[PDB]
Amino acid sequence: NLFNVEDYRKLAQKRLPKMVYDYLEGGAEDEYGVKHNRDVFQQWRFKPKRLVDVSRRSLQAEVLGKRQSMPLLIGPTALNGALWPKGDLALARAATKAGIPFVLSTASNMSIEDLARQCDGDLWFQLYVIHREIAQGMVLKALHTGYTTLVLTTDVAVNGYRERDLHNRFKIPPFLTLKNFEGIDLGKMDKANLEMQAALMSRQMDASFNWEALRWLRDLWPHKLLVKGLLSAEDADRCIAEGADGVILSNHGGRQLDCAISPMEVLAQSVAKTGKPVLIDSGFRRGSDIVKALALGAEAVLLGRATLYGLAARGETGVDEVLTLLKADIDRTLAQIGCPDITSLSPDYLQNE
Amino acid sequence: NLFNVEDYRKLAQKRLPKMVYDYLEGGAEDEYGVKHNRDVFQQWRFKPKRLVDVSRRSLQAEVLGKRQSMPLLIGPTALNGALWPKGDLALARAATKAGIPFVLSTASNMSIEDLARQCDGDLWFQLYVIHREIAQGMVLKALHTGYTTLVLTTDVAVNGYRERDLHNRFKIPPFLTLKNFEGIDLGKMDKANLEMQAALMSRQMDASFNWEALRWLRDLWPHKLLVKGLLSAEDADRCIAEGADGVILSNHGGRQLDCAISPMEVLAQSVAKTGKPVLIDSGFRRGSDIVKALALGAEAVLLGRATLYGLAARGETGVDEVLTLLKADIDRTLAQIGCPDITSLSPDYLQNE
Amino acid sequence: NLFNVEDYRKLAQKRLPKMVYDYLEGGAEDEYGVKHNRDVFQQWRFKPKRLVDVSRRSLQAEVLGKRQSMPLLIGPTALNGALWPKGDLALARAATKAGIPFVLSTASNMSIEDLARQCDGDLWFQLYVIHREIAQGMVLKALHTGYTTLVLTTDVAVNGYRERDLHNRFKIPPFLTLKNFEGIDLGKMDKANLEMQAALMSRQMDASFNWEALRWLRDLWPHKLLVKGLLSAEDADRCIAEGADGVILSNHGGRQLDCAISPMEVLAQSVAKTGKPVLIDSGFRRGSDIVKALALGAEAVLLGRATLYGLAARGETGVDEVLTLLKADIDRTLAQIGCPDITSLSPDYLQNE
Amino acid sequence: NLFNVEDYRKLAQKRLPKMVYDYLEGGAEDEYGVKHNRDVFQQWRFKPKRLVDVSRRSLQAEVLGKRQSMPLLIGPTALNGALWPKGDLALARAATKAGIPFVLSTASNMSIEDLARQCDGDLWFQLYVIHREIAQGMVLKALHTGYTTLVLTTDVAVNGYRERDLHNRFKIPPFLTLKNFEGIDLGKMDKANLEMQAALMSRQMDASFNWEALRWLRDLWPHKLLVKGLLSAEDADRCIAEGADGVILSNHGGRQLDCAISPMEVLAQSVAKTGKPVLIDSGFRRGSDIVKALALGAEAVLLGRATLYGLAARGETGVDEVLTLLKADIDRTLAQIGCPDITSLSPDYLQNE
Ligand SMILES: Cc1cc2nc3c(=O)[nH]c(=O)nc-3n(C[C@H](O)[C@H](O)[C@H](O)COP(=O)(O)O)c2cc1C
Numbered sequence A, B, C, D: 001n002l003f004n005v006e007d008y009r010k011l012a013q014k015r016l017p018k019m020v021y022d023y024l025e026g027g028a029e030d031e032y033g034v035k036h037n038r039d040v041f042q043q044w045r046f047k048p049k050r051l052v053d054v055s056r057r058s059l060q061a062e063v064l065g066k067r068q069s070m071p072l073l074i075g076p077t078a079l080n081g082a083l084w085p086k087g088d089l090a091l092a093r094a095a096t097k098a099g100i101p102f103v104l105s106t107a108s109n110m111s112i113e114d115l116a117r118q119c120d121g122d123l124w125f126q127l128y129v130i131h132r133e134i135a136q137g138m139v140l141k142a143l144h145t146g147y148t149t150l151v152l153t154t155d156v157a158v159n160g161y162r163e164r165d166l167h168n169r170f171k172i173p174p175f176l177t178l179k180n181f182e183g184i185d186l187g188k189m190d191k192a193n194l195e196m197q198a199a200l201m202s203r204q205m206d207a208s209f210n211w212e213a214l215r216w217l218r219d220l221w222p223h224k225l226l227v228k229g230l231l232s233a234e235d236a237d238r239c240i241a242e243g244a245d246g247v248i249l250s251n252h253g254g255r256q257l258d259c260a261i262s263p264m265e266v267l268a269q270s271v272a273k274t275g276k277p278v279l280i281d282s283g284f285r286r287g288s289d290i291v292k293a294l295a296l297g298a299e300a301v302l303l304g305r306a307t308l309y310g311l312a313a314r315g316e317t318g319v320d321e322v323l324t325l326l327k328a329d330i331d332r333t334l335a336q337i338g339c340p341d342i343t344s345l346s347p348d349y350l351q352n353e
């Protein structure tokens, strides 16, 4: 019985070791955040437009000016290889088959170059800055291997307090690898190569990365650049002012700050203020959640745990199945609300509850 | 202990096979819709008018200009024969004994002509359009057999995602029949009779039926015409503008779109805007639910599952009993709020919570 | 462990037959009303006034111009003799010992005259009109035996639909008696005495008793007259306009109409509009509930089930104990909010939640 | 698994006798107050400021003009010696090691002088007035032994109705001592020394202590003076007008009046009106609760049960551990919301829910 995302979560929980399941499903502190991320979608209900010809519907849409099958993307998640063998490639290939982008994490188990060599879909790279020099190395690496878009994740200045991991003394799987940091030499001694090595021997990232640092990254990267982890129209607007081509409103799936607002709470305001592409994630499970955000102005929605449940439960085929269900879900919803063309979605189809 | 509608649901659940019970009780996806349909009635409470002579009360009222015993109707539901033998006739006869209309579904188990020959009450016909030509055949059939009112159901452009059925692999009972589509020939070959046969071999309806298509239906039908499945004052008004004599605000009992608003949410607005008869269904179980809608301007309320629980539990007598309880319920409520004549109901008896 | 009203309810439930307990605790239909009656008190919280000398507090107050120990009364309840032997007298004597009025029901087990002969406290009489002539007989009977105040209950035009009784086929106890209707002759034949006898052979009251009928009652009774069962500032005001000296906002403890508003919802408005004594009941269990109503302008609060739990659990002593706890409760609350004199209570001590 | 305050409560409940645990955890009457104290923090969520350099954070802050490690204090609680041997000293020493003040209760198990002789941290004294003369004795005693700040608790004019204690017939432990009242002589006879002895033989305090009485206390004490137990901007302002250097908004951890508002409800208003230091307690358990109050203008937050769980569970080390977790918690939160310097907190980081 695999008819929705919840069905896959249930199967994933039966197949994954508890420690791994908790690493995936867990949130920060009391987990009021993940619950809120889900609950907030109930603040909106649909007001369908009847007697509209929906015999011919289209989910196709442009994201950052480029067309894709539907306004979805498989977002950046670390240690996918812990959920399923070659998880990164499984996810990437399922996304490509579906006609949507896949975003590779800086903490992926498969390197930037290898995935680019094994998958010819639209690949994006999510950047975490631990060491400026090292980050610059990954950015150029992604540029030269053909990644089309760069995503800077800014909501991990410090690691989230996820108590499930603390209780399980969660340790990154033994057979796993932080490939992107592989071969970053050593044995060298001097300012850097000593200041760099010590930065790599730390589970914390660059907590000083600021606006000036963003400009730096902006000149380094030539293609589309998005800033991820924003929770205010003000920051979204500032990013556009600094060179960003768009943003990704997100609270990291409730894994960083338990009492953070849901990005859905500032979506409309960010769309109205920035006037630029506003993507979003955190809490999406049903096709209706997705349609509600799109109707509020979101350019696209990134999937986090949703597609990971498919991966952990049934590998690549599992990811394919979740994407198939979600697309049909989105399609079905568009038909029932009377909006045949997804790009025609507006707040007019919603009712504030 | 059969003192209310819930008591009949309980009995129906004990007597029906789980698959059939789930077909009846089930809703779309998470079933937040059916729960909302019930919960929304709690947004209103009564402010009784004391010291009013209610020794002589009247539930009689005009619906579309024609008088009936009370502002209730047994709405259109498919496969009633799966709940109880000759369910369609049981429901029709109970409605007639009570003095209210019965609406026959396009997917009923007893044909349009047979029911008209076995029941002389006020019979209405609910139309689903799968094939324009076939629909025209049923419409004329209903006209010639004496049906007084036609109801166009517009909220099934696509089938609702009801997961209970998916889990039970629900298949329309073997002893059941889609009588109205009986004898629609075959063996014929050409444009239609090939385009028509393929349409009949599909569980999906005409998703292209639009406003122009409604005008078409308007000229075809001479008597009262209602459009069912509306969830906005705007669409209700548009229907009146296109020829409709009234509308039926409904979310199909939460069986089509889980996150749809409850029709109660747009009832007052639809009444104020259209200035025409506004009927409503979805979520009604208690006499108070009914009185609240009537007080907000509804012309009448259609019963869906309420009377079906009586049917599945105790057949025709069961339907009679539910209608008797509801009428006494409505009567009792009118007395306790100080409104002896049902047609005197106004929002003045309500308090927004 | 009898430290509050809930503790007495628990004991009463252990000592009373289920049928009797359900007759007492039960409410109409779904019992959302009784739950609401309790929940509504949470819409207000206290904002204590610190550094106020509360070493000398007073709960004494005038009700309808007459002083009593505290702003409480034991309200009218029928069949008290079913909860405890000579329940009516037990309640009356406990009220008198506490220094507050006791209201006798028209459906009490002890007659108007007998209680007046066995209790010398402030006795009030609650009138139910089944037969005008019979009612007039009881009114004059109460006048001549020394009852100080008459209370007309207007919210029982029809009997409430209490399903607990239906399930238990609740029948008024065999050893009980409707004393006030005793000796109303028979064997007589003519217009009345035949129209009167048939009215007595009916469990329903005079559903036609209206405003004109109230004027009738107003001229018949010389002392203080209150109208009970009101749920709107408009009706409260109309009663004052017709001669009433005050009103009692009430929904009959949620026993008549499940979806009725709580009288607390119109308390402030009734106080502001009528400018006359506004008493109230329904849902009061804690001293804080009482203080909140008093702070909103209520002249006094009538106890229903609260003191009945004491009666059913431990008879007269039980009633004494509940009143003692409530008084100390009220006293304690006044001290903690900084309002030493109960007559100084105002909305300034409250916070709307 | 001791990763947060709740983990310590759980351990404390396993180690303490039920009667003692109930004395600590219990609240007044229905305990809706303690639940509300917790729930109210959910009315605010965070709106982090991204791309801010938080590599260098500071929790240091001035409280009443004096710098301390972080805006926290271990508030006044009675009978700490019942939770752990020499509990008062354990708490005082843990507070000092952490760099924050400890407030000694008038009902502590260790005397004013002894703690001052065994701990050289910033010690504050919380005053309860039972006898003016006796109170004056303690005040001067605290002054001469080096206590820096005096705190007048005004919300115990009468003892709270805590039913857990009533059910357990809670009696102050046999090995415990009300040290501060030790050696207050006897055997003396005359006005006082007879009026004083009778006051000491009473579990109730001076319910007459008013504004004039506060002026009296103001002239008696030369250093910083705070008034604790306020629940309105009006009273907070009045205290400043009477000489107070600041206030402590508090509902005594829901132990005095179950329906009292949470001090969080009047925090912003008190800050805006008084323009003086506004401290607060009641319901704080997570670092986020603390940060929310600080962001609303609170000078500091006093811990009650939070650090008591550490004490009862693991003594002094337990208190150290709770303070360490809370500090890291506060630090982590500041980083995740983009506010490196705690004194830079403003309502701009919050979202009203
Ligand atoms: C197991 C797991 C690992 C994650 N790793 C990363 C990462 O390496 N980079 C990043 O930008 N976000 C990371 N995220 C956050 C996601 O990109 C996304 O914001 C989040 O999962 C969205 O919420 P949802 O899980 O409810 O869909 C992770 C989330 C999960 C559940």
Ligand SMILES: Cc1cc2nc3c(=O)[nH]c(=O)nc-3n(C[C@H](O)[C@H](O)[C@H](O)COP(=O)(O)O)c2cc1C
Pocket (backbone or CB within 6 Å): B023, B024, B025, B037, B075, B076, B077, B078, B079, B105, B106, B107, B126, B153, B228, B250, B251, B252, B253, B254, B255, B281, B282, B283, B284, B302, B303, B304, B305, B306
């Ligand atoms: C078993 C079942 C079958 C239904 N079949 C039809 C149908 O054939 N035509 C139609 O217009 N509505 C159909 N409906 C919807 C009803 O007309 C009505 O909108 C709905 O049941 C109202 O909600 P309620 O069930 O809460 O009363 C069906 C509902 C149920 C429960």
Ligand SMILES: Cc1cc2nc3c(=O)[nH]c(=O)nc-3n(C[C@H](O)[C@H](O)[C@H](O)COP(=O)(O)O)c2cc1C
Pocket (backbone or CB within 6 Å): C023, C024, C025, C037, C075, C076, C077, C078, C079, C105, C106, C107, C126, C153, C228, C250, C251, C252, C253, C254, C255, C281, C282, C283, C284, C302, C303, C304, C305, C306
């Ligand atoms: C067992 C029972 C019998 C009652 N009988 C009467 C009656 O004879 N006359 C009347 O005016 N109200 C009657 N009432 C209503 C009370 O006067 C009062 O409105 C109600 O109990 C107040 O609510 P509470 O029970 O929550 O306090 C009755 C209530 C109960 C619980």
Ligand SMILES: Cc1cc2nc3c(=O)[nH]c(=O)nc-3n(C[C@H](O)[C@H](O)[C@H](O)COP(=O)(O)O)c2cc1C
Pocket (backbone or CB within 6 Å): D023, D024, D025, D037, D075, D076, D077, D078, D079, D105, D106, D107, D126, D153, D228, D250, D251, D252, D253, D254, D255, D281, D282, D283, D284, D302, D303, D304, D305, D306
């Ligand atoms: C066991 C216990 C004893 C207390 N004793 C006192 C006291 O002696 N003096 C005082 O001012 N407050 C006293 N308080 C109240 C605290 O100072 C503080 O207001 C309260 O605990 C804050 O709420 P919290 O427990 O949720 O942190 C006590 C609280 C508890 C839990």
